[PDB]
A paper describes a structure:
The structure of H2O2-activated ATM reveals a disulfide-stabilized ATM dimer, having a unique orientation of one protomer with respect to the other, with the autoinhibitory PRD element displaced and a p53 substrate peptide bound. H2O2-activated ATM exists as a dimer. During our data analysis, we did not observe ATM monomers, consistent with results suggesting that H2O2 activation involves disulfide bond formation between ATM protomers. By superimposing one protomer of the basal dimer on the corresponding protomer of the activated dimer, it is apparent that the other protomer is rotated relative to the aligned protomer. In the consensus map for H2O2-activated ATM, we observe additional density that crosses the approximate twofold axis between ATM protomers. This bridging density is absent in both our and other previously published basal ATM structures, and we attribute it to a disulfide bridge between the two protomers formed under oxidizing conditions. Upon addition of H2O2, a disulfide bond can form between C2991 residues from each ATM protomer so that the PRD can be stabilized in a conformation that clears the substrate binding site. Once protomers are rotated and the PRD is displaced, the disulfide bond can form under oxidizing conditions to stabilize the enzyme in an activated conformation. This stabilized H2O2-activated state has a conformation that enables p53 peptide substrate binding and remodels the ATP-binding site to increase the catalytic rate.
Numbering used by the authors:
A (entry chain B): 2052 to 2112, 2121 to 2554
B (entry chain A): 2387 to 2573, 2591 to 2964, 3002 to 3056
C (entry chain A): 2052 to 2112, 2121 to 2219
D (entry chain E): 12 to 18
The structure:
Amino acid sequence: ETAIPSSTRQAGIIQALQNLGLCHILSVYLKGLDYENKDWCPELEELHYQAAWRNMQWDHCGTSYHESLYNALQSLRDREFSTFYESLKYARVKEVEEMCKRSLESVYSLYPTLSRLQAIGELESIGELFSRSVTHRQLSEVYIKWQKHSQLLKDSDFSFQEPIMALRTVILEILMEKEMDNSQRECIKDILTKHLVELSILARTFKNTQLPERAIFQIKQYNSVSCGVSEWQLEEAQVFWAKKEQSLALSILKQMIKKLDASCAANNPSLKLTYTECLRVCGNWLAETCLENPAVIMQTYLEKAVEVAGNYDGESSDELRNGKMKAFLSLARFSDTQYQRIENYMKSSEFENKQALLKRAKEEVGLLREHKIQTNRYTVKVQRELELDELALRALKEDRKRFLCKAVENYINCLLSGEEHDMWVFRLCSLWLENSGVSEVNGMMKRDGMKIPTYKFLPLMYQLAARMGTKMMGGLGFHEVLNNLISRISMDHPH
Amino acid sequence: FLSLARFSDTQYQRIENYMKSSEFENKQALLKRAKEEVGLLREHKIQTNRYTVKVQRELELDELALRALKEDRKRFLCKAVENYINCLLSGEEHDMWVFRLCSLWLENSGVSEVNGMMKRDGMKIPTYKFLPLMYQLAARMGTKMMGGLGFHEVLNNLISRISMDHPHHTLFIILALANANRDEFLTSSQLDEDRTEAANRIICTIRSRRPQMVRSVEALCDAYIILANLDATQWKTQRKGINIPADQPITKLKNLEDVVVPTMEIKVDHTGEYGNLVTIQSFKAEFRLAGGVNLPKIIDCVGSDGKERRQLVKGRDDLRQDAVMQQVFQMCNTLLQRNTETRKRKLTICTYKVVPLSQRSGVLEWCTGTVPIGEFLVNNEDGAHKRYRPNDFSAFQCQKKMMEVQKKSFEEKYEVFMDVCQNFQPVFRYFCMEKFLDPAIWFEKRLAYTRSVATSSIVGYILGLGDRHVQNILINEQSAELVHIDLGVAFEQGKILPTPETVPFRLTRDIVDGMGITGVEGVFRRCCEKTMEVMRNSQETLLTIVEVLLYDPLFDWTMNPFNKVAERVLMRLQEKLKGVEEGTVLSVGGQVNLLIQQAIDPKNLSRLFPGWKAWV
Amino acid sequence: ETAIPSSTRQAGIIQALQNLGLCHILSVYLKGLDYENKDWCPELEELHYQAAWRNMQWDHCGTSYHESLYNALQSLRDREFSTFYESLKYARVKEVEEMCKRSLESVYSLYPTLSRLQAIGELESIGELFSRSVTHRQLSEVYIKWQKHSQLLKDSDFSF
Amino acid sequence: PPLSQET
Ligand SMILES: Nc1ncnc2c1ncn2[C@@H]1O[C@H](COP(=O)(O)OP(=O)(O)NP(=O)(O)O)[C@@H](O)[C@H]1O
Ligand SMILES: [Mg+2]
């Protein structure tokens, strides 16, 4: 569309190119605009400065916020702190006065100004850190402060967070460029990789795939692959998954699993937790896409991850317990989905027709056995197909029972020491009250689930109190354990 | 018209599926309980409280909703049938939907309105559009579908008109249906007797207009039947050739002008007169044995053009299943051609005409220009494996090991299979290499071979084809496309055999190596995915083709006193097509990957029959 | 990705922009390439001429097929036919000789050459029609012939 | 020996 005036059409094109992950193309397009158009309007000049500082185009040479930011970055690269501080002060004053001159009355208008001032403050902190020297402890405290601030900015929009992440990436790149060869360089590289992966998840949660790809490209440019794959390969696999490239992501994750399970040697707990996360992700992907039957993939991935997490839980760290809880939740959800699918299949009319055909076959075989009749090909075929049908039905019933037991056990394990996964308790009830006829699940509930905290059943307290009827004849054990649980809950919370 | 008809058909199918669901059954049970409770409350003098009024009002609302749903379904069915008739009255590019019309006419024969509208408006429909479904129409003369005499009479009139218009493609089916007990006569329930009587009525009605053609065709059919019933157990030791005795009428049956060879396909036109068709001129005086317990007979016939054509008469066997297999093969080929995704890939299925002649006999077209896979690969004299890899184990050694290990356990069988596979490398990849020196022609033939293998494997898995040893597959010397010739057992019959078939199709090492360096990945996987997608899109047509059963069951079933095994195989085929199985959903790519894993798994190959040549 | 050499990376970028419907953006990007890079390789120059004639950028000024096509279009716009016919003949000769110099052996390679020769023939027909005057019947017959031929090209690929 | 598994 060419009817839009060039005053805002060019700005819209540049913004779209920025949000599409195109940097070099944008730079060449802006150079073409400079060639064809001589004079620069304030808006296009500000966009030019934004692209110059964002793309680290140091070759290109009141002032706007982006112009001041680029000048401050150039001064920091030139070790000229006085002009750097002066430019930041001028940018702060300009932003404050521009914000306060308008009529305000809208909260949403404050967000861009707050983001710009946060970026200026972060650059001030970086300048203070880089004023005389850089140490590992200072970099670590700066990074943990940045992570805390990002956690406070979880509810914020991606538009107000993207400049912050871009400025952080530029700052880390500048520090990497001007760092002498030592362990401090390795620490800064690790911090840069962690910042890039956090940006990758941040952009992935906002339905963006180009910025995570650029982050992974930068990681590959800086970091190098080795025998032991790091945690950013899993992030690359997730990014490729988000790009509808399921096959490539699955192949990469399978290669990661093959590398990890053959050369683990308990080298690092971080490797163990990332292996568990990769196994859980692979199990979830196979469950969603259904490229293989659940029987083999479940044992290959979910139980392997569960046992890996449980065999080395001697530290009781948060970064291990959260992963264990996530793996337990994924396994429980897969088991519950399989059980629900099996139950729905059994309740369908097709299952009823199959049962009627099986009953007809049984009665025909009975009549053929009662009367002395020679065994022809038809009788042998009928007997063999009946045997196969019986075996298939028995296997399906056993598999459904095992799925139900696994789901209940995983719910119990997740809820024993879990807080963020307390909304699934209803499902546990949906898998316990509806299946009170099985003694095994009731015994496991009364053995392992007896220690579950009583404050998680308050929303479903009425449901539990409505299940003392004898119409659900499933033995006295279920009734007594339900009564004991209700009594304990009432004692804990009489109100 | 097509859009309106498709919408009406989709709505009718959705309503029918909803009515057949368990939720509808539960609603009907609740409605019956409400009806009986209201009846008891009315029989006994009980005051009308809030509960009684609520129950009565909800019952009335449920009854009104059910009546409205039934009326809407009936109106949708009528609209769909009427729109199909209107589209097919003067339509040419929309001729593939006729099956759906049959799916909406034969399944709803109990309604008099649709039959009357078919006999009033659809009576002028051209008769050349029902040829692919002519067998389906000829299989519906049974009285088990009691929907009034009007449906039966209109079906008989339509069949008679079609036979009069195209006698070449119609008389053979009717004669085969009417000759169920011809073998016993020359040497049976109420439904069979009624079908035979209807077939006899059709035959006499046709012969009233074309006596000479009908009598010549039935004489040829009787000659074929008596040739099939001939006992050749005394000639089992002769392979060069045995002269047919002069007492057989086939020897004296020559110079046919109104009889067209059945084993050769005829390009049907829009005109009811044929004058440029190859007829039967003479029959050879010698026949050869193809081997086996049943001793099939091989004959050669010289037509009007003078070109000799080879036919295989298979006595003491039922080719009706093979006829259905050939029909569904042609349907799949037509569906692949219609789809633009597979038309570019040139996915085709090699088919040979099979003409049933009786319940226990029939004939088929012999495949020319093809060589057996086993004869090329594991020949004792000039086998490819011996020629290329003399140091490797011979076929005789592998057969001896397999014979010696069949009495062992699973572990020994797996170990010996792995050892055999270690010392037996694929050699099939050299086939085109030794037959197409030009790289362009070589790659073209290799690509055609891979595509044919993929399509044939997919269709065989869908149809449950299990007898896939080296002698049942013939490779062409020019097109290099595999052709399936035996089709003796299918529909998941290998499990019935003492040695279960653990694979859906033959994907041995030789085939994979001959597909190229890429193996199963590449052309094979994409072709399998495309074929699976086409089948998922045309499950309706596939079910329409396969539903010929439940009305004229073939031999070996319903013996030793809504067919049981026919319903079971229909359910299995529907589960395979929908990808539901035991309630689990599977994508086309996931299904293809699972099939590949099952086929190439050495564990499944170990338990296969030693004569199946799993290692080969 | 920057590891790809600029010899084919620029061509791939230009092709992607062409297939994405971006014309003015492609023109500005190509102008930026002209500013930053002085010398023009044959491939990028051919792409420049293709973008010039496709976008009707008449301001921009042996010869490649796209160069010959642009020159013929400019000559037709200037009511000049001798140079137009000569350029079309030169383009035909160049395409034929380039196609026949290689080893061939592949049908798929013939499709681009056939498409280019069909385009040249269509331009020849347009020039013959516009040589002296245009009438409704001539335009109608040209359009129905084009529609018929496009019906013959239903099975052809969209790239050609 | 027969290739197919008879009966
Ligand atoms: N269409 C065909 N073209 C060529 N040869 C064929 C064809 N059909 C069968 N044969 C040959 O016929 C012989 C066996 O006959 P066949 O039709 O397979 O019935 P069969 O005797 O039951 N085979 P089997 O199932 O192993 O007992 C083999 O030598 C096959 O190669
Ligand atoms: Mg056979």
